[PDB]
């Protein structure tokens, strides 16, 4: 029960043939693509500066968050095991 | 193009070995989340079933 | 932490007051526009009733080999394939689950009939032993 | 594309820089000349605070095109939201029926044990009455 | 990932539906038990208003990474938003370079006529003097 | 209608109070986060002075076409590749204009030093003429 998105997705799935992507930027009519590669390589060389500026701190800053989100799941797993075990214990008696 | 492409690809490989540990580490953490998210929902089955 | 429609990590989480569950603003607004009620509880809910939340501004590290070409060509294509085949597999599993539910209900009715027959057999055998 | 005083289509859209909501030069200027305050929030506002004729400049304006830059991305976002919204309702029914499947299989084996016991009960009763 | 009141990592997260900022079930419970309000905004709150964190639905999620189409659209939007100011950095500097060029060329055009007049006057005076 | 930073149609515009300019919240936010001033007036401004504007009616969504999405991806790629070249040409021209300005300034500096010798020759001519 979806919008036309559903029709195009099902046609692309039954059809299976994935939609044509951007194969213009990398090859480099060619002058514009070339200047595009120039601006994009400059933007990329700028985007790798702000990564190395902080560096490995930002990765572990989210890795601590990853472990902190991980712990609550096993805590709730323990809760669920305990509740099911108490139920089975009552049924046993 | 080829001058800066060689620059950023070299800039990636400084970070691709830098973050590449955290990449497989975050990939390893996400595999554990997807491992539990089945059994966590498997807990939802065995609750209302029981 | 998550959104309760899209299964995403919301960037602007908003919680409802009739059913307290964090939803993404976009999907919750679209749901309110489709039909004016809560998705989870199906209770009366409007866009004005929702209360936006403030959060840790949570961050994603773009891969080191991030460019307009890899974002445009490979990434979106991988995303669309992971959408299409996953929706297709979920539809197939739904059909299979309906079929298995049908087989289970038939087997349950058969067990009910067999038990009903043994209830008439066993009790009269007991009476005949009492006779 | 409407003035917030007259409700007419503004040809010279100015905004007052206190509670900006685009109006037209004539209505806003006359409202300022009546009393030097903004009609929307009733705050202090003058003629010089108002920002006038549109800003077409270093920009080289592109009338909203079909297939140019960003509408494709907004459309991809609108379609991905739909994909996820449909996945929500699909997975809901999947798991909600899976719960019935589990309960039904459980009760099926449970009631199977009922006949398993009752059959041997009748079986013993048969030899009991037969020997007597 | 943290509790706003204690600043410790909550192992029992409960988000309230008034002024949500993920809080500790144990600490938020006591804050509501002492007085019926939310810790941050001081809005009315009960423990029944609170809800612990749970798995959204049976729609399965995946981690927020670069792969996600939404993160890709946000990244493309940020890239275009940086390129936009990148364009202004050069257009505005061109707007000063062009003004200086107009002024310098006008000074050169105003000076060169007088320089030609000097080139006339020196040789006219020399031909006048040498002739006598 | 057009923010005086990005040229894009502002979806959450805010006005500057030191200088009357309706800009984009995020672009102005990054500009103030780098340096605490106004990009047009260079006047001291902060975040809290900003007055969020409301423009509810103006929003018009682009209904590009029925056109298939596989062509839409190439549309976005073509537009990004074109915007990169429009940004390249807009900087090389500025660098060339600054070079030309300096190259005119050099002659502007030489002309007034030629004028000194011209005036000296004129004084010599009058000094001979009076005699």
Is the four-CA dihedral C63, C68, C73, C76 of positive or negative sign?
positive
Nearest chain C residue to B12 by CA distance is C64
State whether residue C127 is helix, strand or coil.
Answer: helix
Contact partners for chain D, using 3 or more CB pairs closer than 8 A, are A, B, C, E, F
Q: Does B45 touch chain D (CB under 8 A)?
A: yes
First-to-last C-alpha distance (Å) of chain A? 49
Instruction: Give every CB contact of residue F28 below 8 A, 6+ residues apart in sequence.
Output: F5, F14, F16, F39, F50
Distance CA(D106)–CA(C104), nearest Å, equals 10
The breaks in chain E (C to N more than 2.5 Å) occur after none
Distance CA(B35)–CA(B46), nearest Å, equals 17
For residue A67, the chain B residues in CB contact (below 8 A) are 29
Q: Which helix (H) or strand (E) holds E73?
A: helix E69-131
Which structure tokens are listed for A86? 């108490």
For residue A90, the chain B residues in CB contact (below 8 A) are none
Of C5, C107, C122, the CB nearest to D108: C107
Nearest chain B residue to E58 by CA distance is B41
Q: Does D76 touch chain A (CB under 8 A)?
A: no
Distance CA(D51)–CA(F22), nearest Å, equals 9
Q: Does A63 touch chain B (CB under 8 A)?
A: yes
CB C22 within 8 A of CB E22: no
Nearest chain A residue to E8 by CA distance is A68
Distance CA(C41)–CA(C38), nearest Å, equals 6
Distance CA(E31)–CA(C1), nearest Å, equals 22
Nearest chain D residue to A9 by CA distance is D83
Q: Does B19 touch chain E (CB under 8 A)?
A: no
Chains B and F touch (3+ CB pairs under 8 A): no
Q: Does E91 touch chain D (CB under 8 A)?
A: yes
Contact partners for chain F, using 3 or more CB pairs closer than 8 A, are A, C, D, E
Across the interface, whether the CB atoms of B29 and A66 are under 8 A apart is answered yes
Shortest distance, CA D62 to any CA of chain F (angstroms) = 10
F21: phi then psi, degrees, rounded to nearest 5: -150, 120
State whether residue C37 is helix, strand or coil.
Answer: strand
CB C105 within 8 A of CB A55: no
Distance CA(E114)–CA(F118), nearest Å, equals 10
Distance CA(D114)–CA(C48), nearest Å, equals 56
Is the four-CA dihedral A5, A9, A15, A18 of positive or negative sign?
positive
For residue D70, the chain E residues in CB contact (below 8 A) are 77, 80
Instruction: Give every CB contact of residue D95 below 8 A, 6+ residues apart in sequence.
Output: B41, B44, B45, E58
Report how many Cβ contacts below 8 Å link chain B to chain E: 16
Q: Is F127 exposed, middle or buried (0-12, 13-18, 19+ CB in 10 A)?
A: exposed
For residue E90, the chain F residues in CB contact (below 8 A) are 87, 90-91, 93-94
Residue closest to E69 by CA, chosen among F101, F7, D79, F64: D79
Nearest chain C residue to F72 by CA distance is C72
Residues C61, C62, C64: CA angle, nearest 5 degrees: 105
Residue C15, strand partner residues:
C22, C51
CB D92 within 8 A of CB E58: yes
Residue closest to A38 by CA, chosen among B5, C13, D85, D102: B5
Nearest chain C residue to E66 by CA distance is C62
To what resolution in angstroms was this structure determined? Answer: 3.0
For residue D99, the chain B residues in CB contact (below 8 A) are 44-45, 48-49
Nearest chain E residue to C80 by CA distance is E69
Q: What is the CA radius of gyration of chain E?
A: 38
Shortest distance, CA D83 to any CA of chain A (angstroms) = 8
Instruction: Give every CB contact of residue D44 below 8 A, 6+ residues apart in sequence.
Output: D18, D36, D37, D38
Q: Does B26 touch chain E (CB under 8 A)?
A: yes
Question: Would strands F21-24 and F13-16 be described as parallel, antiparallel, or unpaired?
Answer: antiparallel
Let me know how long chain F is: 131
Distance CA(C119)–CA(D33), nearest Å, equals 97
Nearest chain A residue to B50 by CA distance is A84
Shortest distance, CA A59 to any CA of chain B (angstroms) = 7
Q: Is E54 exposed, middle or buried (0-12, 13-18, 19+ CB in 10 A)?
A: middle
State whether residue F23 is helix, strand or coil.
Answer: strand
Distance CA(E125)–CA(D2), nearest Å, equals 74
For residue A18, the chain E residues in CB contact (below 8 A) are none
State whether residue D75 is helix, strand or coil.
Answer: helix
Q: Does E60 touch chain D (CB under 8 A)?
A: yes
E24: phi then psi, degrees, rounded to nearest 5: -75, 130
Give chain C as a DSSP string: ---TTT-S--SSEEE-SSS--EEEHHHHHHHHHHSSB-TTT--B--TTT-EE-----------TT--HHHIIIIIHHHHHHHHHHHHHHHHHHHHHHHHHHHHHHHHHHHHHHHHHHHHHHHHHHHHHHH-
Distance CA(A67)–CA(F70), nearest Å, equals 40
Q: Does A65 touch chain E (CB under 8 A)?
A: yes
Of B41, B44, B49, the CB nearest to D106: B49
Burial B5-43 (b: 16+ CB within 10 A, else e): beebbebbeebeebbeebbeebeebeeebeebeeebbeb
CB C114 within 8 A of CB D108: no
For residue B49, the chain D residues in CB contact (below 8 A) are 99, 102-103, 106
Rounded to 10 degrees, the C-alpha dihedral F10/F13/F15/F21 comes to: 0
Distance CA(C60)–CA(A88), nearest Å, equals 44
Which structure tokens are listed for E39? 């810790």
Q: Is E62 left (phi over 0), alpha (psi -120 to 50) or beta?
A: beta
Across the interface, whether the CB atoms of F54 and D19 are under 8 A apart is answered yes
Of E58, E70, E73, the CB nearest to D95: E58
Distance CA(E15)–CA(E108), nearest Å, equals 72
Q: Does D69 touch chain F (CB under 8 A)?
A: yes
Which structure tokens are listed for C56? 């840790």
Q: From the CB of residue E68, how many other CB atoms can be counted at a distance below 10 Å?
A: 20
First-to-last C-alpha distance (Å) of chain C? 71
Q: Does F73 touch chain A (CB under 8 A)?
A: yes
Q: How was this structure determined?
A: cryo-EM
Which structure tokens are listed for E131? 């002739």
Q: From the CB of residue F23, how many other CB atoms can be counted at a distance below 10 Å?
A: 24
Place of tokens 């549109």: D54
Distance CA(A60)–CA(F124), nearest Å, equals 82
Q: Is E45 exposed, middle or buried (0-12, 13-18, 19+ CB in 10 A)?
A: buried
Distance CA(E44)–CA(E35), nearest Å, equals 9
Across the interface, whether the CB atoms of D102 and B41 are under 8 A apart is answered no
F9: phi then psi, degrees, rounded to nearest 5: -75, 115
Shortest distance, CA D26 to any CA of chain E (angstroms) = 32
Distance CA(F29)–CA(F27), nearest Å, equals 5
Q: Does E62 touch chain B (CB under 8 A)?
A: yes
Place of tokens 């120039």: A38
E23: phi then psi, degrees, rounded to nearest 5: -120, 160
């Amino acid at each position: 029960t979806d919008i036309m998105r559903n029709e195009f997705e099902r046609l692309a799935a039954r059809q299976p043939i994935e939609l044509l992507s951007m194969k213009r930027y990398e090859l480099p009519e060619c002058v514009n693509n070339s200047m595009a590669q120039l601006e994009h390589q400059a933007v990329r060389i700028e985007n790798l500066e702000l990564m190395s500026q902080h560096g490995c701190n930002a990765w572990k800053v989210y890795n601590e968050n990853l472990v902190h989100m991980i712990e609550h799941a096993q805590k709730e797993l323990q809760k669920l095991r305990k509740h099911i075990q108490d139920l089975n214990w009552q049924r046993k008696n | 193009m080829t001058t800066e492409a060689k620059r950023a690809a070299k800039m990636e490989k400084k970070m691709k070995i830098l973050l590449g540990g955290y990449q497989s580490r975050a990939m390893g953490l996400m595999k554990q989340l997807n491992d539990l998210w089945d059994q966590i929902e498997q807990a939802h089955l065995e609750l209302r079933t029981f | 932490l998550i959104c309760s429609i899209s299964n995403e990590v919301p960037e602007h989480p908003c919680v409802s007051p009739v059913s307290n569950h964090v939803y993404e603003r976009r999907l919750i607004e679209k749901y309110i526009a489709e039909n004016g009620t809560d998705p989870i509880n199906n209770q009366p809910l409007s866009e004005e009733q929702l209360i936006d939340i403030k959060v840790a501004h949570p961050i994603r590290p773009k891969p080191p080999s991030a460019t307009s070409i890899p974002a445009i060509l490979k990434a979106l294509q991988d995303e669309w394939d992971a959408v299409m085949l996953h929706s297709f597999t979920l539809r197939q599993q739904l059909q299979t689950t309906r079929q298995e539910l049908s087989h289970a209900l038939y087997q349950h009715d058969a067990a009910c009939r067999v038990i009903a027959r043994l209830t008439k057999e066993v009790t009269a055998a007991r009476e005949a032993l009492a006779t």
